[PDB]
Design a protein around this ligand. Structure first.
Ligand SMILES: N[C@@H](Cc1ccc(O)cc1)C(=O)O
Length: 427
């Protein structure tokens, strides 16, 4: 199967300058392509996965991928399809983020063989480029009227928009020059990016022709949309980060389990490296069997193993099988650290708290008298087992939370009823 044919089978080609010439080029020889990533936070999230995965899909076919970290463009800010001005980050801020997201992109690509990936930083050439040379050597090739009519910023320019500063209005010049520079340095003849990068990609296509007299191509990936209209990574708990210390592999694994039946087969094509045929068998088995669909679990296993690793997937599976389980002895200290991060509503308690005190402190009851009914109804579980009396009282301390209930001397899973429960953390 062709490289382009594989991407269009997955619905991964949104816009491309010449699909026939790009397809014929990839079958005739191996090329170098590049994609740019701007440091806007201390870590990436799932909304950034498509471009770096698409780079890997090209590297699998023997092409050389270039991952550009925006050490310089991150100091300006991409205004493409943004209705409000981004704020300016400090040089110290961006330099740290450059090292962070660089450590997150490198695992996705191979650095062996002739097609080994290349990590680039546009601060290498902009960090020593004088402002006059910037405005002249780059700026003379840009028409302000053409810049104003770009869809990516036209909504900001109109009378209804919030306006744009000269800073962000100049961003397409930096990203445009990156394509010409990477074409000169590493023979980059293709730039891929997110769906909102069409304006800045074609700018680097034109600029590469004017500066290097070379024909290059651009391809944008689809906007990851959901069937119900909601945003892709918007969850109740926030964003689904790639850094395990921001979102636990359990919650990462949980996010992909909850994918809708309409979205799960497209997400398998977008994000996994299972073949179109393998995904086609997964879909047909679910569509023919009257049982629950298996695609969400397969999606969750593929994404957790890819981003976090095989052991972290095992941890997420072990937590998922133990959190609502009768026997929780499988949970480890690291498993509870995941739970305290974003697995369960965590609450700090100290020695001496009884059962009804923790039942209302965690929100599992409105009042203690209401929780006292839940206690005597045998509807309260501690680490999978119902609470038992263990005191000669003093009034409500008959059900006390003593050290026996402390998992690793720090954690206790408090459960009330069939659903909804909390995590106790001992200080
Ligand atoms: N504009 C891209 C980042 C980028 C930076 C430099 C480039 O050459 C290309 C792309 C983004 O907003 O995500």
């Amino acid at each position: 199967m062709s490289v382009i044919q594989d991407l269009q089978s997955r619905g991964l080609i949104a816009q491309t300058t010449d699909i026939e010439a790009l397809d014929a080029l990839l079958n005739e020889q191996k090329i170098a392509l590049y994609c740019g990533f701007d440091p806007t936070a201390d870590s990436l999230h799932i909304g950034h996965l498509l471009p770096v995965l698409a780079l890997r899909r090209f590297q699998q076919a023997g092409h050389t991928p270039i991952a550009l970290v925006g050490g310089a463009t991150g100091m300006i800010g991409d205004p493409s399809f943004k209705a409000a001005e981004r704020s300016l980050n400090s040089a110290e801020t961006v330099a740290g983020w450059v090292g962070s997201i660089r450590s997150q992109l490198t695992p996705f690509l191979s650095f062996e063989g002739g097609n080994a990936a290349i990590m680039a930083n546009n601060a290498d050439w902009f960090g020593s480029m004088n402002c006059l040379d910037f405005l002249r050597d780059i700026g003379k090739h840009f028409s302000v009227n053409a810049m104003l009519n770009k869809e990516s910023v036209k909504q900001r320019i109109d009378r209804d928009g919030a306006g744009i500063s000269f800073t962000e209005f100049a961003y397409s010049l930096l990203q445009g020059y990156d394509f010409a520079e990477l074409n000169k340095r590493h023979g980059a003849v293709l730039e891929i990016g997110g769906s909102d990068q069409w304006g800045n990609i074609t700018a680097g296509i034109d600029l590469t022709r004017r500066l290097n007299q070379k024909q290059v191509f651009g391809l944008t990936l689809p906007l990851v949309t959901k069937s119900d209209g909601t945003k892709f990574g918007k969850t109740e708990g926030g964003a689904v980060w790639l850094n395990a210390k921001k979102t636990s592999p359990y919650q990462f694994y949980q996010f992909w389990l909850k994918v809708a039946d309409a979205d799960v087969y497209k997400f398998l094509k977008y994000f996994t490296f299972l073949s179109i045929e393998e995904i086609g068998v997964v879909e047909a088995k679910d569509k023919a069997s009257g049982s629950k669909p298996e695609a969400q679990r397969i999606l969750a296993e593929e994404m957790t193993r890819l981003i976090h690793g095989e052991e972290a997937l095992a941890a997420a599976q072990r937590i998922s099988e133990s959190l609502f389980a009768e026997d929780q002895s499988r949970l480890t200290e690291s498993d509870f650290e995941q739970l305290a991060l974003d697995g369960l509503p965590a609450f700090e308690v100290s020695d001496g708290i009884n059962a009804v005190e923790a039942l209302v402190k965690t929100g599992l009851a409105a009042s203690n008298k209401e929780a006292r009914g839940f206690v005597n109804a045998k509807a309260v579980l501690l680490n999978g087992k119902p609470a038992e009396a263990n005191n000669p009282n003093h009034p409500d301390d008959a059900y006390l939370l003593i050290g026996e209930y402390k998992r690793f001397g720090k954690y206790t899973i408090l459960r009330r009823g069939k659903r909804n429960h909390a995590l106790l953390v001992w200080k």
